Amino acid sequence: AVSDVWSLSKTSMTFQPKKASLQPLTISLDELFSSRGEFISVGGNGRMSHKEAILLGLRYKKLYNQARVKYSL
Amino acid sequence: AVSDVWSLSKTSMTFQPKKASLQPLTISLDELFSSRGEFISVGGNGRMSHKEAILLGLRYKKLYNQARVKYSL
Amino acid sequence: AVSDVWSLSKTSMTFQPKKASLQPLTISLDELFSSRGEFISVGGNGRMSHKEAILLGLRYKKLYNQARVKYSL
Amino acid sequence: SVTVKRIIDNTVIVPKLPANEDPVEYPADYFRKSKEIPLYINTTKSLSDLRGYVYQGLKSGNVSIIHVNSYLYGALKDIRGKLDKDWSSFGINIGKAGDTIGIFDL
Amino acid sequence: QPDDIEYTSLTTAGLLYAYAVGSSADLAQQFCVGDNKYTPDDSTGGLTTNAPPQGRDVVEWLGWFEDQNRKPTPDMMQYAKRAVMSLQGLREKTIGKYAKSEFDK
Amino acid sequence: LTNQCKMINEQFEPLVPEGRDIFDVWGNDSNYTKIVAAVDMFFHMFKKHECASFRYGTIVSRFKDCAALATFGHLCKITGMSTEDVTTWILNREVADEMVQMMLPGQEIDKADSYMPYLIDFGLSSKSPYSSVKNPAFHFWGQLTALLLRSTRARNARQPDDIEYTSLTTAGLLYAYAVGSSADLAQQFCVGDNKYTPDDSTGGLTTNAPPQGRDVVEWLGWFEDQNRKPTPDMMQYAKRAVMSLQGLREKTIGKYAKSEFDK
Amino acid sequence: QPDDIEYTSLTTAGLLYAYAVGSSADLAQQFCVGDNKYTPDDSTGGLTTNAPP
Amino acid sequence: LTNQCKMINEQFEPLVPEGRDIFDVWGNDSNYTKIVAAVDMFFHMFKKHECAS
């Protein structure tokens, strides 16, 4: 209900696999984060887009670098 | 919390680093302070300029001096 | 909520057995969830169908590959 | 970092440690000056005489290593063991199709 | 235990590679009678991970470890303990004494 | 004894037990501590001579009274850090003085075969500069650090008198912390695929964590944020390192760490 | 331990000077390559002022 | 023993234990070791040979 990028936290992003035994990584911003306070407490802003903001959703839970090397970021 | 320069508790502050070696620290007044139990506790006025009130918050995340020989403050 | 399938989901699919002496597994979306204690925490999209909502939903009592070879899931 | 200085007096410093080397030696290198291994063992002290000094001297201080060196050649000296394939290592040829060989054949 | 080396590093390094192996066993069917298992193509995600990588691929674990702030995790720390504790009567200056006195806490 | 008698076989020789009498006092001669020093220096050139076995006893003359230079090499090898990163990581006025003293140019301390190692026995010097009593702070700091880093020999190193322990100890601890808390760790070999991670570090703002690698400057800033009093995790790392240490002898930097940190 | 002196007073004074030298190591950078720390403003001015000097 | 006792029963022969006294500098003899290898390398080839023991 606040910022602006937070509206699209229901809608998902999908990253395509790097290998043959893999299916795509479908992720959403509501899922990765906790609520709202968490989003700004780890350095979220309203001045963002989706891709640049959904990678900050990846990192805080500790799985950026795994995806970075298993999917197309 | 009801202050004059407090409204910007969601606004971006992009600090450009050295070159392309490291990435900008997308910072705001909400990753540094909760509500009034940290900001309205140590030199917290409404006269404070945006950058002159952010720079104080660089103590909470314990990276004021850690991020001094790094970025253009 | 404004989703077509979240709470209002109580349809049991007659998944035929593989062994020549068994009875079809007919499950729904409450044997595999609770309310907002699994949909929000790990996995799930609001754009999915009836199969891929129960396919990815098939993990609560800890069975997916066990029911993969014993039924045509 | 070929330049470090005391950040107050601004003079240079050249951090250095004392020398150490002891570089390795690979098995192949030896087979480049010599294609043989020098075994200095033989004494003309008559085969049988040695058999008694490696026993009676095997008490304390007696039994010289020259005694056990000469005796041990003595006994093993004989030629035995049909070569059932081939033998060659490090550009050296020991056995061929079907020689016989002995321990001493080095 | 060899003198003059990168202890708090070689150790961490090994703790990882040790954790990787015994954390995921090859584990796979070998003989049958008509029927068998398989799951190469059948694997899904979408924030269901937050758990160590499957198999023993180097670059994947490395990623995972980059995720863990490059410091060993409580569990991979605990793994060590269980490994080293219950050893009895160690010789002095061995890697065994090193291991126990490092991890058994 | 045995190292000389290459199968000559004797028994027991020096009868009465040592009272420094018929034993130690043999090297007060300017001309004999000279002979030890020249035998060693020569047979260092080619150790493959028939008679290289001489150094079975002349070794101790090499870097006799140069333990400080010796300590330095060990820190390097323990930290795994460069020949100068360690120098940059020095954070004490009184240890940097001694450190200038050691590294003063034109002394051939880094040349293979040289007179340098024997200056005390060779009678070149009476009071050596690279001694562990004329660099008594570098010794304590280097050793405490090496120890906190899982050193096997540091445990039994002499603790100098009349130095700035307090200042010398947090400094050692912080260093130890830095090099301990985060390691090298980069993929070294591969077949087809490998981990790329060049410009990758922080997306930001979670932080509070200690710095990435071992930049002396990053750490010094971080430490400035902890109000300059060493933090729980640091104090734990040490306790962690020095507990389980047993049978320490008195006046060692080992007994020192264990008393300073295990509580 | 000396005799007939003022213990409940030299010890305080001592322990204070002890706490002081204790709580404040010199700790400042001594050698560098190109960059070094300098610890500028906000070295005291930020109302942390509760901890020791 | 059990080996150095193939057919004829023979007990201990040396008196003073190792302690670098009797058969110490044998392994310093660049001829005994050099023979030792010979035996071993040879028998490693004919693992089945009679005297491989």
PDB file of N, CA, C and O in Angstrom, chain G residues 24-42:
ATOM      1  N   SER G  24      41.887   2.230  25.828  1.00  0.00           N
ATOM      2  CA  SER G  24      42.279   3.003  24.663  1.00  0.00           C
ATOM      3  C   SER G  24      43.655   2.652  24.119  1.00  0.00           C
ATOM      4  O   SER G  24      44.656   3.293  24.455  1.00  0.00           O
ATOM      5  N   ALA G  25      43.696   1.634  23.267  1.00  0.00           N
ATOM      6  CA  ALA G  25      44.906   1.320  22.520  1.00  0.00           C
ATOM      7  C   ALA G  25      45.211   2.439  21.523  1.00  0.00           C
ATOM      8  O   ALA G  25      44.317   3.171  21.110  1.00  0.00           O
ATOM      9  N   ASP G  26      46.480   2.582  21.158  1.00  0.00           N
ATOM     10  CA  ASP G  26      46.876   3.570  20.159  1.00  0.00           C
ATOM     11  C   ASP G  26      46.149   3.237  18.853  1.00  0.00           C
ATOM     12  O   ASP G  26      45.301   4.003  18.393  1.00  0.00           O
ATOM     13  N   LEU G  27      46.479   2.075  18.287  1.00  0.00           N
ATOM     14  CA  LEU G  27      45.847   1.526  17.079  1.00  0.00           C
ATOM     15  C   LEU G  27      45.532   2.555  16.006  1.00  0.00           C
ATOM     16  O   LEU G  27      44.444   3.136  15.976  1.00  0.00           O
ATOM     17  N   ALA G  28      46.524   2.777  15.150  1.00  0.00           N
ATOM     18  CA  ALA G  28      46.417   3.631  13.976  1.00  0.00           C
ATOM     19  C   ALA G  28      47.340   3.051  12.907  1.00  0.00           C
ATOM     20  O   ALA G  28      48.372   2.467  13.248  1.00  0.00           O
ATOM     21  N   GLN G  29      46.987   3.207  11.629  1.00  0.00           N
ATOM     22  CA  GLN G  29      47.762   2.578  10.553  1.00  0.00           C
ATOM     23  C   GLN G  29      49.204   3.096  10.458  1.00  0.00           C
ATOM     24  O   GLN G  29      49.467   4.279  10.689  1.00  0.00           O
ATOM     25  N   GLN G  30      50.121   2.191  10.109  1.00  0.00           N
ATOM     26  CA  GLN G  30      51.559   2.450  10.200  1.00  0.00           C
ATOM     27  C   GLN G  30      52.338   2.266   8.893  1.00  0.00           C
ATOM     28  O   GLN G  30      53.397   2.878   8.709  1.00  0.00           O
ATOM     29  N   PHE G  31      51.833   1.410   8.006  1.00  0.00           N
ATOM     30  CA  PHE G  31      52.409   1.238   6.664  1.00  0.00           C
ATOM     31  C   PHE G  31      51.312   1.070   5.620  1.00  0.00           C
ATOM     32  O   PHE G  31      50.241   0.551   5.930  1.00  0.00           O
ATOM     33  N   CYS G  32      51.572   1.506   4.389  1.00  0.00           N
ATOM     34  CA  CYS G  32      50.569   1.397   3.330  1.00  0.00           C
ATOM     35  C   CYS G  32      51.158   1.328   1.930  1.00  0.00           C
ATOM     36  O   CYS G  32      52.349   1.606   1.729  1.00  0.00           O
ATOM     37  N   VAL G  33      50.295   0.972   0.974  1.00  0.00           N
ATOM     38  CA  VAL G  33      50.633   0.883  -0.449  1.00  0.00           C
ATOM     39  C   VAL G  33      50.250   2.176  -1.185  1.00  0.00           C
ATOM     40  O   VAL G  33      51.120   2.884  -1.701  1.00  0.00           O
ATOM     41  N   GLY G  34      48.950   2.471  -1.220  1.00  0.00           N
ATOM     42  CA  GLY G  34      48.418   3.685  -1.847  1.00  0.00           C
ATOM     43  C   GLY G  34      47.334   4.329  -0.997  1.00  0.00           C
ATOM     44  O   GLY G  34      47.325   5.549  -0.804  1.00  0.00           O
ATOM     45  N   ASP G  35      46.426   3.493  -0.491  1.00  0.00           N
ATOM     46  CA  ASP G  35      45.360   3.922   0.417  1.00  0.00           C
ATOM     47  C   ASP G  35      45.689   3.602   1.877  1.00  0.00           C
ATOM     48  O   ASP G  35      46.452   2.678   2.168  1.00  0.00           O
ATOM     49  N   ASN G  36      45.099   4.380   2.780  1.00  0.00           N
ATOM     50  CA  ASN G  36      45.233   4.189   4.217  1.00  0.00           C
ATOM     51  C   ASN G  36      44.038   4.796   4.926  1.00  0.00           C
ATOM     52  O   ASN G  36      43.297   5.574   4.331  1.00  0.00           O
ATOM     53  N   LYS G  37      43.838   4.442   6.191  1.00  0.00           N
ATOM     54  CA  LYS G  37      42.787   5.087   6.969  1.00  0.00           C
ATOM     55  C   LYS G  37      43.278   6.407   7.572  1.00  0.00           C
ATOM     56  O   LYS G  37      44.479   6.595   7.824  1.00  0.00           O
ATOM     57  N   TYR G  38      42.336   7.323   7.775  1.00  0.00           N
ATOM     58  CA  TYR G  38      42.628   8.625   8.348  1.00  0.00           C
ATOM     59  C   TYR G  38      41.658   9.008   9.468  1.00  0.00           C
ATOM     60  O   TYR G  38      41.940   9.933  10.227  1.00  0.00           O
ATOM     61  N   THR G  39      40.537   8.289   9.569  1.00  0.00           N
ATOM     62  CA  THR G  39      39.499   8.503  10.607  1.00  0.00           C
ATOM     63  C   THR G  39      39.059   9.965  10.844  1.00  0.00           C
ATOM     64  O   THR G  39      39.314  10.520  11.917  1.00  0.00           O
ATOM     65  N   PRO G  40      38.364  10.581   9.863  1.00  0.00           N
ATOM     66  CA  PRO G  40      38.080  12.020   9.959  1.00  0.00           C
ATOM     67  C   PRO G  40      36.857  12.343  10.831  1.00  0.00           C
ATOM     68  O   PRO G  40      36.618  11.653  11.826  1.00  0.00           O
ATOM     69  N   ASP G  41      36.104  13.384  10.462  1.00  0.00           N
ATOM     70  CA  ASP G  41      34.928  13.833  11.227  1.00  0.00           C
ATOM     71  C   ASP G  41      33.912  12.715  11.493  1.00  0.00           C
ATOM     72  O   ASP G  41      33.886  11.706  10.780  1.00  0.00           O
ATOM     73  N   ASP G  42      33.080  12.920  12.517  1.00  0.00           N
ATOM     74  CA  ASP G  42      32.301  11.852  13.170  1.00  0.00           C
ATOM     75  C   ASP G  42      33.203  10.950  14.025  1.00  0.00           C
ATOM     76  O   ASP G  42      32.840   9.823  14.373  1.00  0.00           O
TER      77      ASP G  42
END
